[PDB]
């Protein structure tokens, strides 16, 4: 009812591997960018070029939005930082870009 989730809400997408979790998140981000807003998508298991190629088959164009300066796609393994510095980097980056949707 009303056309979707509330704006500042917290949404959890759950499922088994291959379910479509990444595709739904990318659809969220791509729509957010398509409305002219800004999105940040933090992936911890796939690379940027690989994620772009994978989403391209589903008809999304995440590259258009990266090249337009409306989607920041950040990829880092969980072992690259300590739990404190992961949080620090995420918060700093979110601050600077001032996103509307963070995944």
């Amino acid at each position: 009812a009303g056309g979707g989730f509330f704006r500042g809400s917290s949404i959890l997408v759950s499922g088994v591997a291959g379910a479509g979790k990444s595709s739904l998140a990318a659809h969220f981000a791509a729509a957010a960018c398509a409305r002219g807003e800004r999105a940040m998508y933090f992936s911890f298991e796939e690379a940027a070029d690989q994620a772009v190629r994978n989403m391209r088959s589903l008809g999304l164009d995440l590259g258009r939005w990266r090249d337009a300066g409306l989607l920041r796609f950040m990829a880092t393994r969980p072992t690259f930082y300590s739990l404190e510095m992961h949080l620090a980097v995420i918060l700093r980056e979110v601050m600077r870009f001032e996103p509307s949707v963070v995944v």
Partner: protein, 155 residues
């Protein structure tokens, strides 16, 4: 304590350095000289004297220290005087021994702070840290055949 004339040692070390025009130095088994000192304050003063003399020359120095029964050093004072402290460890778990490395202190910059297993092998020390692995690959558009033509038809 004070039995050894450290200035005498300083004279000699100078001779050795000027022979080859050294820019790197290793002091190995300084425990022989400093295990004698049996008052905590006097020992720390002598260690500071030696370290200050080394720092004055501008010589990149590595000092090997023995853990003994201590966390880092037997006498427990050298780790509070140096600027870089590196601990090497060899622990046994379930009958398997692992060489590990750690940078306990390094004043002046950022560095790794975890324990990094390493290997002494035919060519020397080898460290392949897991924190250096990123996610920056390159992607290709060709495909690889499986040798099962039926399975390839499923894709």
């Amino acid at each position: 304590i004070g039995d050894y004339d450290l200035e005498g040692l300083f004279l000699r070390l100078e001779l050795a350095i000027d022979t080859v025009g050294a820019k790197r130095v290793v002091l190995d088994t300084i425990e022989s000289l400093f295990s004698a000192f049996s008052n905590p304050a006097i020992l720390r003063a002598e260690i500071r004297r030696l370290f200050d003399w080394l720092k004055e020359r501008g010589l990149t120095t590595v000092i090997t220290a023995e853990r003994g029964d201590g966390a880092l050093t037997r006498q427990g004072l050298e780790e509070y005087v140096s600027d870089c402290v590196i601990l090497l460890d060899h622990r046994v778990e379930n009958q398997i021994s692992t060489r590990r490395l750690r940078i306990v202190k390094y004043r002046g910059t950022a560095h790794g702070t975890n324990e990094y297993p390493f290997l002494i092998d035919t060519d020397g020390f080898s460290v392949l840290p897991v924190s250096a692995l990123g996610l920056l690959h390159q992607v290709h558009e060709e495909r690889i055949a499986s040798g099962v033509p039926d399975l390839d038809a499923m894709m």
